[PDB]
Amino acid sequence: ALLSFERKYRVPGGTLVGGNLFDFWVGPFYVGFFGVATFFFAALGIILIAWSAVLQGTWNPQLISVYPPALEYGLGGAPLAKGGLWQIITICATGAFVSWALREVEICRKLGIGYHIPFAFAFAILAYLTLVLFRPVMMGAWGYAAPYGIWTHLDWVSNTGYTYGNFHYNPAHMIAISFFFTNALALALHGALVLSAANPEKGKEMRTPDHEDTFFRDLVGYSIGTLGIHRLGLLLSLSAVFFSALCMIITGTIWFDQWVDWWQWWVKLPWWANIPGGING
Amino acid sequence: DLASLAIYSFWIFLAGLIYYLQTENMREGYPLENEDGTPAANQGPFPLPKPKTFILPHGRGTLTVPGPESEDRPIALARTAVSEGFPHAPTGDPMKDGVGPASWVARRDLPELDGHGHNKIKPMKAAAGFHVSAGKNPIGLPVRGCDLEIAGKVVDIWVDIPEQMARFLEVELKDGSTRLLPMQMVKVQSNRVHVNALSSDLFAGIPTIKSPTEVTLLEEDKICGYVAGGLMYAA
Amino acid sequence: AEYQNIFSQVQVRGPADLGMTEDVNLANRSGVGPFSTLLGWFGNAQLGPIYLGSLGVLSLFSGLMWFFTIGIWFWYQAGWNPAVFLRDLFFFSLEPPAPEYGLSFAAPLKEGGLWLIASFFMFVAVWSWWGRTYLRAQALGMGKHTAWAFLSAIWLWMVLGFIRPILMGSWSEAVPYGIFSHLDWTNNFSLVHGNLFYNPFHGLSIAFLYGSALLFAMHGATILAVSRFGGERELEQIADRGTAAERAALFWRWTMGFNATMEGIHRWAIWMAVLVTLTGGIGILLSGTVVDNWYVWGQNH
Ligand code: BCL
Ligand code: BCL
Ligand code: BCL
Ligand code: BCL
Ligand SMILES: CC[C@H]1c2cc3[nH]c4c(c3C)C(=O)[C@H](C(=O)OC)c4c3nc(cc4[nH]c(cc(n2)[C@@H]1C)c(C(C)=O)c4C)[C@@H](C)[C@@H]3CCC(=O)OC/C=C(\C)CCC[C@@H](C)CCC[C@@H](C)CCCC(C)C
Ligand SMILES: CC[C@H]1c2cc3[nH]c4c(c3C)C(=O)[C@H](C(=O)OC)c4c3nc(cc4[nH]c(cc(n2)[C@@H]1C)c(C(C)=O)c4C)[C@@H](C)[C@@H]3CCC(=O)OC/C=C(\C)CCC[C@@H](C)CCC[C@@H](C)CCCC(C)C
Ligand SMILES: COC(C)(C)C(=O)C/C=C(\C)CC/C=C(\C)CC/C=C(\C)CCCC/C(C)=C/CC[C@H](C)CC/C=C(\C)CCC=C(C)C
Ligand SMILES: CCCCCCCCCCCC[N+](C)(C)[O-]
Ligand SMILES: CCCCCCCCCCCC[N+](C)(C)[O-]
Ligand SMILES: CCCCCCCCCCCC[N+](C)(C)[O-]
Ligand SMILES: CCCCCCCCCCCC[N+](C)(C)[O-]
Ligand SMILES: [Fe+3]
């Protein structure tokens, strides 16, 4: 139940709430007040979902699905069976995630590390809350929100995109995708670089960071360096999620026409709007 | 149907891969242990992988993992409860004893080397061609701890030669000796360097290094350990 | 404010670093470029040197040829008018031969010929760059991880521009060169195959793409959180585990019940990423060659 080096770190302290009340582990897991909050929110929420399963009439996870109130309840409540189950499950999910984050903070304090991980997590939570809370509210109804099921939440992505034509043309969505692809490029490179240094040609000695710099300078004439690359991955990946939330919060709110048409501001600029030739004249 | 073969084959591959990866990540810390150091009954469902050997450069040796594991240090902690899974209370001063968020590991007592074979980290004074190139130069600033008392003054930056970055500030105390602070644990301001982890009176207890122009991995771990431990143990 | 280590507080510079030598032919390295104080808040300040041997020059030149071949066409499309070229830059497109010309090289320059030319240049640019990936590692005696990985990206690219067009019997299947048009082609590809959300490879591919952001967020943040113990010195933490690597592992173990090593996390990393384009290229390759409609295929399988 402990890693060979673990015991020295398992000391009292760190907790944000409760003093020593929940200062302990179960097997590998740290608990804390927020471990308790998480179990409760998640347990309730799974229960509500398994309940919401029977009222719809399956035990198949490929079919189990839970919808927001319909479009006409606005931002009010709803019979459990017609979207209150969803509202509460959402409250549960939020409580679970925020709890998980705050528990992550408690683990940080006990371990004397920095808060970067739960801070990073908090971006993911904010993306979620954009789909299910902030966007709906700004838009006047729960019913715009994503629903909960494996294949039905895809349906929503698709219906939502196609409401604005080809969603490709959402320009914040473009920036977002760019960060996604770039982050994966950087993850492949990072993983491969470190591994190539630690696992060199058979029989040779472990290489060094200087080898890692050299390989990259050789290859593309620049190397961001070992502090830099971890800064980079973090930035790329939080930026992807930042723009993801952005691209959706502006959609159905400040812009609600076909995204392709947004690009007309560019082509319609005075100094060139009327010159003939090309694609738009 | 081909697409069906491919997808089914893929799930099998992916299960193989997760297995391989999980066992690769068992090359340290394993086998699991009871709170008293003996092998735990339950090791989980993944076996330890077959050992591999890293050839260290500059005749520094090899490393074989997994291998017989060992703290190579006394750990000043005691149980606070009669069964598995509770906190272990420091038996003395946890900053001095190096436990909790003040832990350090018994890394090799040599300094890290660059690919050329020279010490990775040097004070800048001894580093040929190295100077502050941007940002406020901290050398000369008073150093202030979390008690808002001045604990000393910055007398150099220790820099990483191959990666060209600042790694520690070297600080001089009232008594004329110096200590390293990790660069990541200070805030350089226009008229001071502030250190939120330590109060002024804890500076003297920063672990000292034995040479003034090099630091060993073991000495780095004790310094970083000790300073990080102040976040919990100072207030 | 506690300090976070996302931007350096003090930069420090010394003699340009010219690199390790190992078996590299030094005659082919440039000299150092300048130093960017800008970059150096975040990463290294030093630009270059770069290594440009023969394969390097080959790659770089075809690469530019591919690029200029598209750009000449774009200018042509714009009737040589600077203002129109800029106005319409995302709209121009260099399209492949129509279905009628099959896999042949017959089509007129202005209706596919140029496309084939640019593509030819793209092919040599990339494959030569691949080899440069392998050769630059060899000269330093390093593992071939980078080239193996790049191979996975090359896989999706080959499938889109070459393999799947060939298996389908025409070049008209391939992706056009243009900003807006390649997006249109993507949307259209999905509609015509009954919606890629029904391609199980497509959804694996997304799991990994999302997963790479999750993982790199986890890892990046983890390393910066233990950078106050020298965490980012990963090769030495692999060779001689420090308290950085221990606090890192234990953060995750306490959070989610298992953890990595300082070496292993990089294996999780390279694979999370590489599997994006692996599964991806498989999904695309199967589309229209074996499965005409993902929805349909989903209903049987
Ligand atoms: C995967 C399914 C589709 C596809 C779907 C999408 C979608 C959807 C989106 C993009 C977007 C992009 N795609 Mg595309 N893309 C495809 C395959 C490609 C290929 C290729 C050689 O196979 C290329 C070169 C590109 C290139 C691009 C860029 C224009 C843009 C950002 C890419 C990126 O960040 O990459 C890695 C990042 C790097 C920084 C490394 C490479 C650096 C530069 C930026 C690459 C650009 C090359 C190009 C020649 C420059 C334009 C010249 C003009 C003067 C502007 N795509 C396939 C066919 N692509 C996004 C966009 O903004 O489009 C407008 C977007 O939303
Ligand atoms: C037909 C579909 C439309 C389209 C319409 C949309 C729509 C609609 C949306 C996107 C969104 C996105 N699209 Mg788009 N999209 C299209 C084409 C593309 C293409 C492409 C190559 O063609 C790409 C690459 C993308 C990529 C993207 C991203 C920028 C973004 C999704 C990531 C995200 O938001 O994560 C953020 C991460 C999360 C939301 C997850 C948060 C996780 C939480 C915090 C915790 C989970 C805990 C969990 C319950 C597990 C616990 C159990 C444990 C496992 C034990 N789109 C087409 C044109 N796209 C979405 C977006 O931007 O959202 C903000 C969005 O809503
Ligand atoms: C982010 C933009 C869109 C979106 C667009 C898509 C698209 C498009 C696709 C998915 C796919 C997935 N999405 Mg979704 N998805 C959205 C928001 C969510 C949320 C959420 C709580 O906000 C969750 C939990 C999920 C979960 C999922 C998984 C079922 C699947 C793989 C994701 C993954 O690997 O991520 C990276 C994370 C990891 C590798 C960590 C592990 C995450 C595990 C696998 C989550 C399992 C959750 C479980 C099924 C349901 C709850 C568990 C219990 C009830 C507690 N999506 C929003 C609405 N999502 C893919 C799929 O295959 O769908 C069928 C796919 O193509
Ligand atoms: C409406 C559009 C369709 C759709 C149609 C497609 C199509 C079509 C494809 C994808 C593909 C993908 N889609 Mg989809 N996609 C949709 C909805 C989504 C959504 C979403 C939230 O709804 C998401 C998250 C995604 C996400 C994704 C990606 C996971 C996947 C491509 C991965 C990648 O890294 O490629 C980017 C990486 C590459 C293209 C590799 C490039 C490698 C080459 C070698 C680089 C050459 C560089 C060149 C020389 C330029 C150099 C310039 C430099 C400056 C030097 N899609 C909807 C349903 N999607 C791809 C896939 O794999 O599908 C299975 C694909 O072909
Ligand atoms: C911000 C950048 C990226 C990111 C970062 C990120 N995620 C993180 C972290 C960080 C830094 C963590 O520290 C934390 C973690 O512990 O990772 C292992 C985490 C995490 N991100 C996870 C998932 C996740 N992240 C995703 C994405 C991203 N995470 C971004 C790309 C996605 C995507 C892309 O779809 C998913 C699915 C988990 C592995 C973990 C958080 C685990 C957690 O909160 O546990 C508490 C809750 C439960 C155990 C269960 C709650 C369930 C109930 C409330 C009911 C279910 C609700 C309902 C929403 C189900 C929906 C079903 C779907 C089909 C729609
Ligand atoms: C496996 C998943 C990810 C992946 C991995 C990956 N990519 C890779 C590698 C790996 C492992 C490499 O080793 C290789 C590399 O060298 O990385 C730095 C590479 C690479 N991936 C690249 C791009 C790329 N990767 C992508 C994606 C991905 N790569 C996946 C997400 C994408 C996407 C998402 O669309 C792109 C666009 C290149 C940076 C590089 C391969 C380079 C190559 O083959 O280049 C040939 C040489 C040339 C084209 C020179 C021509 C330059 C011109 C195009 C002009 C420049 C334009 C302008 C902006 C500058 C001004 C010019 C003026 C003179 C006019
Ligand atoms: C400023 O003006 C000047 C003139 C200086 C310019 O040069 C400006 C330049 C431009 C404006 C260029 C702009 C370029 C673009 C917009 C390019 C955009 C390209 C993409 C978005 C690419 C998307 C995907 C491309 C793919 C998938 C390519 C695959 C290629 C194939 C794998 C290669 C196949 C080879 C073939 C078909 C020929 C093989 C023949 C044999 C005999 C082997
Ligand atoms: C995305 C896949 C997530 C990986 C899940 C693999 C679970 C690993 C659990 C094994 C670790 C338990 N332990 C420490 C006893 O070995
Ligand atoms: C003698 C002068 C030679 C200078 C050579 C410098 C090369 C600079 C190339 C840097 C670009 C690499 N990139 C785009 C990936 O960052
Ligand atoms: C190497 C990392 C392993 C993590 C993989 C996580 C897989 C998520 C499952 C998504 C379901 C895909 N599909 C096609 C059946 O829909
Ligand atoms: C795809 C989601 C999978 C969730 C993975 C969580 C597994 C953690 C297991 C840790 C405990 C192992 N055990 C039983 C030996 O203690
Ligand atoms: Fe790393």
Short mmCIF file of N, CA, C and O and ligand atoms in Angstrom, two decimals, chain A residues 28-29, chain B residues 42 44-45, chain C residues 256-258, ligand 11:
data_model
loop_
_atom_site.label_atom_id
_atom_site.label_comp_id
_atom_site.label_asym_id
_atom_site.label_seq_id
_atom_site.Cartn_x
_atom_site.Cartn_y
_atom_site.Cartn_z
N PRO A 28 -4.01 3.80 -1.81
CA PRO A 28 -3.18 4.87 -2.35
C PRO A 28 -3.85 6.24 -2.28
O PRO A 28 -3.16 7.27 -2.30
N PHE A 29 -5.16 6.27 -2.11
CA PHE A 29 -5.90 7.50 -2.29
C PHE A 29 -5.83 8.39 -1.07
O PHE A 29 -6.08 7.97 0.05
N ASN B 42 -0.52 -7.31 -1.20
CA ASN B 42 -1.18 -7.07 -2.47
C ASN B 42 -0.37 -6.13 -3.40
O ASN B 42 -0.26 -4.93 -3.16
N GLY B 44 -1.08 -5.66 -6.59
CA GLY B 44 -1.92 -5.40 -7.76
C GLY B 44 -1.66 -6.37 -8.89
O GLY B 44 -0.87 -7.31 -8.74
N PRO B 45 -2.33 -6.15 -10.04
CA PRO B 45 -2.38 -7.16 -11.10
C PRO B 45 -1.26 -7.09 -12.12
O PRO B 45 -1.20 -7.96 -12.97
N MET C 256 -5.33 9.84 -7.80
CA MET C 256 -6.04 8.98 -8.71
C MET C 256 -5.59 7.55 -8.56
O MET C 256 -6.01 6.69 -9.30
N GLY C 257 -4.73 7.26 -7.61
CA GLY C 257 -4.46 5.87 -7.24
C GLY C 257 -3.35 5.14 -7.98
O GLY C 257 -3.04 4.01 -7.64
N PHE C 258 -2.73 5.79 -8.96
CA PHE C 258 -1.56 5.22 -9.60
C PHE C 258 -0.70 6.37 -10.15
O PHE C 258 -1.07 7.53 -10.07
C1 LIG D 11 -10.81 4.63 -17.82
C2 LIG D 11 -10.97 4.85 -16.31
C3 LIG D 11 -10.16 3.88 -15.43
C4 LIG D 11 -9.99 4.33 -13.97
C5 LIG D 11 -8.62 3.91 -13.40
C6 LIG D 11 -8.48 3.97 -11.87
C7 LIG D 11 -7.61 2.82 -11.36
C8 LIG D 11 -6.92 3.13 -10.03
C9 LIG D 11 -6.54 1.85 -9.30
C10 LIG D 11 -5.69 2.13 -8.06
C11 LIG D 11 -5.84 1.07 -6.97
C12 LIG D 11 -5.22 -0.31 -7.30
N1 LIG D 11 -5.28 -1.24 -6.15
C13 LIG D 11 -6.58 -1.95 -6.11
C14 LIG D 11 -4.22 -2.27 -6.26
O1 LIG D 11 -5.09 -0.61 -5.08
#
